[PDB]
Amino acid sequence: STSTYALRAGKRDVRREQQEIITRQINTAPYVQDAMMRVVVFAQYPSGRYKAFDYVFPDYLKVFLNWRELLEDTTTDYDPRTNTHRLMGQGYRQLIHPNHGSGEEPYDTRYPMGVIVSFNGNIDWTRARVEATNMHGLNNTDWREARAWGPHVICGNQLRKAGHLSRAVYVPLDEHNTVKVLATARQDGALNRFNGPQLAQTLTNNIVCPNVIEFNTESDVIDYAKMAHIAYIDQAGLIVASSDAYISGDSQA
Amino acid sequence: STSTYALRAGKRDVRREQQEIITRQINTAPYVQDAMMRVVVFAQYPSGRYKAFDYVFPDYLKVFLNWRELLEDTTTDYDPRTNTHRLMGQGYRQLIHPNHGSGEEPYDTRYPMGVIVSFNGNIDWTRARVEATNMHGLNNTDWREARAWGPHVICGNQLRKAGHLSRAVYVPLDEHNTVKVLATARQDGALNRFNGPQLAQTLTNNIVCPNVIEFNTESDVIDYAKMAHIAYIDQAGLIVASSDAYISGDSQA
Amino acid sequence: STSTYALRAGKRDVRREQQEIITRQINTAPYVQDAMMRVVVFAQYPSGRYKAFDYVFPDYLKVFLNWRELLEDTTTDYDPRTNTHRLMGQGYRQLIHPNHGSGEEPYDTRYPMGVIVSFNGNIDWTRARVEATNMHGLNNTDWREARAWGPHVICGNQLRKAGHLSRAVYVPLDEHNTVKVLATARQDGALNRFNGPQLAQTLTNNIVCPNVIEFNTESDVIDYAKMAHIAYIDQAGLIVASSDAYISGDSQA
Numbered sequence A, B, C: 001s002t003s004t005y006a007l008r009a010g011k012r013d014v015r016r017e018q019q020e021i022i023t024r025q026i027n028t029a030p031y032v033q034d035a036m037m038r039v040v041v042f043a044q045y046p047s048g049r050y051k052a053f054d055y056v057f058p059d060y061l062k063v064f065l066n067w068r069e070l071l072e073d074t075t076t077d078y079d080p081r082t083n084t085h086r087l088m089g090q091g092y093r094q095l096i097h098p099n100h101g102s103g104e105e106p107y108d109t110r111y112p113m114g115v116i117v118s119f120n121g122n123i124d125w126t127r128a129r130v131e132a133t134n135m136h137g138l139n140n141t142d143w144r145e146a147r148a149w150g151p152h153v154i155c156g157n158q159l160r161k162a163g164h165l166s167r168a169v170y171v172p173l174d175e176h177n178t179v180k181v182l183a184t185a186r187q188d189g190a191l192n193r194f195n196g197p198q199l200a201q202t203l204t205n206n207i208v209c210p211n212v213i214e215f216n217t218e219s220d221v222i223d224y225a226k227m228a229h230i231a232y233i234d235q236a237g238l239i240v241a242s243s244d245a246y247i248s249g250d251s252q253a
Helices: A014-031 A092-098 A195-206 A216-226 B014-031 B090-094 B198-203 B218-228 C012-030 C091-096 C195-205 C218-228
Strands: A037-045 A050-056 A060-063 A115-118 A131-135 A166-172 A179-185 A211-213 A239-241 B037-044 B048-059 B059-063 B113-122 B131-135 B166-172 B180-184 B209-215 B239-241 C038-043 C051-059 C060-065 C114-120 C129-132 C166-172 C179-186 C209-215 C238-240
Touching: A037 A060, A037 A166, A037 A216, A050 A060, A050 A216, A060 C195, A092 C209, A115 A179, A131 A166, A179 C195, A195 B059, A195 B180, A195 C195, A211 A216, A211 B090, A216 A239, A239 C060, B037 B059, B037 B180, B037 B218, B048 B059, B048 B218, B090 C209, B113 B180, B131 B166, B131 B198, B198 C060, B198 C179, B198 C195, B209 B218, B209 C091, B218 B239, C038 C179, C038 C218, C051 C060, C114 C179, C129 C166, C209 C218, C218 C238
Parallel strands: none
Antiparallel strands: A037 A050, A037 A115, A050 A211, A060 A179, A115 A166, A131 A179, B037 B048, B037 B113, B048 B209, B059 B180, B113 B166, B131 B180, C038 C051, C038 C114, C051 C209, C060 C179, C114 C166, C129 C179
C-alpha cells in the first residue's frame, strides 16, 4: 500500500475519532446476532446481461433455483416463452425428463453460463455452501444415495475471501444444472441460537426477502454491488466490491 | 349498548346453553395450540380495487411482499406488463437499482397507496409486527446496520384492537416500499412450543397457505372479511368485521 | 413368485456379494439421516395429461398447492388465461369468494380430477399426511375451529404400501379443493433431530427443491416414476413403480 505523512488535531479531534467509531460500527454491527446478512446469486448470461437473486435475511438462507428461475428475463418459476400445452418448444421438459421434450435448440441461450455467489455478513464460513445440482436439485443421479450435500459440495476456500465480512465464488454451469445455496449465522460463541429457548426468535424472525433484478451489462452489476456493499467478482476475475468499510476508502492506492 | 327485557326457559333450556357453549367454542378454540391463525394483507389501490394476501397458518407466519407482488393484478413476483428484456418500461428496475431503469411514469398506478394488515387468532400480540421496508426489504438503507426489525417497527397499539381475537392496522406506503409481516402463536403459558421436544411439531406442522384474491370495490372486501371472520378497517376508518362471535350478533344496536 | 435353480461361484464370488451389498446400500442409504427423501404430487387432468410437483428434501416437507397452482399448464400461482383486471373470466375469484367471480364455465377443465401423492424414503409413516382442503387451505369452513390437520386427515394405510421405502395414495378432488402434504424424517431412534443441538442442521440443511413437470400422457408419467425410483399408482390402480431395489429386478415373474 501507498501511505505517507498525515496530520490530525490532538485530544480535541473527536470528530475524527467519532468517524473512526462509525467505521467500526459499520464493520461490526453485522456481528450482532439477528443483524441482516446478504447473499446474492448473479447469473451471467450468454447475452452479456446478468440477473441477481438478492436475499437479505437475519438468521439463515435456504435457496434452490430451478432451471426456469435461472433463465434470462424470468422472475419466477414461469417461462412466458414456453406455453406448456404446445407440443413443440418444451426445452425444460426435455432436460428434466430426458427425451420427453421438444426444445427448439440444444442450448436455450437464456440459460446462464455460471453464477457468482456473494456471501456477506456474520456468516458461518465453515458451513457456507453452494452446489450446481442436476435438474431435480439432486447431487447424485440416484436420489436414494443423494444427501443434503454432495461429497464435493462447493465450500471452504472455493469461496474467495473478499474482506473480513465477505466471500464470493464463481460457479460454472452446464445447461442441466440448478443452483443451491446455504448460509447461516455464525455460531453465537458457545451458545447455540438454534437451540433451546433461543430458537423461537431465530426461526420466526427469519423473514427472507428475495428480489430478482436484471442488469443489461456488467458495469451495472458492479454498480449494484457497490451500492449494496457486497462482494463481487467481475469478468476479469477481480474483486471489485466488498462489505468492508474503510474510513478513507481506497486511500492507499 | 341498548339492551332490554328478555325471557328464556328454566333448567330445561339446554338448547340456549348449548348455543352459549358453541359461541364460547368459536371464541376459544383458536387458543388451543396448533389451531389455525389468520393474517390478511389488503392492498388498497389507486383504482379503488383491492388485493388480499390471505394466510392461514397454525404456528408462525413470515411474510415478505416485494414490489411486483404488491402490484394490482399480479399474483406472484411476475409482472406481465413489463417484459424485462425491453430497454423501455423497466419501472421496477428504476426503483430497486436507482437510475438504471426506464418506467413510463413516475408512479406506476398499480402500486398500492397502503395496506390494511389484519391479525387474527391466538397471536402473540407483543411480537406481532409489520414494516414498510425499502425495495430490498431492508429497514436501514445500509444493510450492515439493518436488523431483523427496525427501531420503529410497527407494533403494539399501532395494531388496533378489534376484539379479543383480532387487531388491524393501516400502513401507508410510498412507491419504493415493500411489506414485511410477522405473527406467531402466543407463548404456551410457561411452556415454549418452539423449545425442546415440542419444536418438531410446531415447525413441521406449520404449512402456511397463501391465496391472492382481488376485489373490484371495497364493498366486496368487506364482504370477504365478514365471510372469513377477520378484522377489517374500511375507508371510513371503522372496524367493520371481527373474529369475535356473539350469540345474537350485534343485537345491542 | 416364480423361482427355480440358480448357480454361483463359491468363496471367490465377491462380484456377486459386492452387487448384493450395493443393492442393500441403495435400499438403506435413504435411512441415514439427512439423506434425501422424495415426495411427488401427480395431478391427473381431464385432458388425460398430468403434472408433477416433485419435491426432494432431506428433513421435512411442508406443501400447500392452491387452486391456480393446481391448474393444467400453470407452473406457479399465476394463470395466464385469466387477466384479473377483466370483469369477465374470473373463475378462481368465483370459487374462493363465492358469487364474486365470473368464470366462463362451471368446471374449468384445467382443474385436476385428483392427485396421486407418492411418499418415498426414510419418512415417518405415522405422521405422513395429505388433505384436500377448501380454497383457503382450511379443513373446516370456519377457520376458528380449523386446525393444522382435520379430524379425518388422509393418513395411515390410506397411504398404500408400495415397498419398504414407499407409499402412495390417490386423492379425488372437486373443483373447490386445494392440496396439503406433510412428510418428515422418521424419528432418529430415541434421539430427536428436531431437538436441542441437532436442530440447527435439521432446519437449515432442509432446502426443499421443487419442480413442476408436465406429461402428455400416463405412459410418460409412469416412465418418469421409474426414472426417479418412486412409487406410482397408474390408472388401473396398480403399483407400477417403487423405490425398492432388487438385485435382479422383477426376476421372479
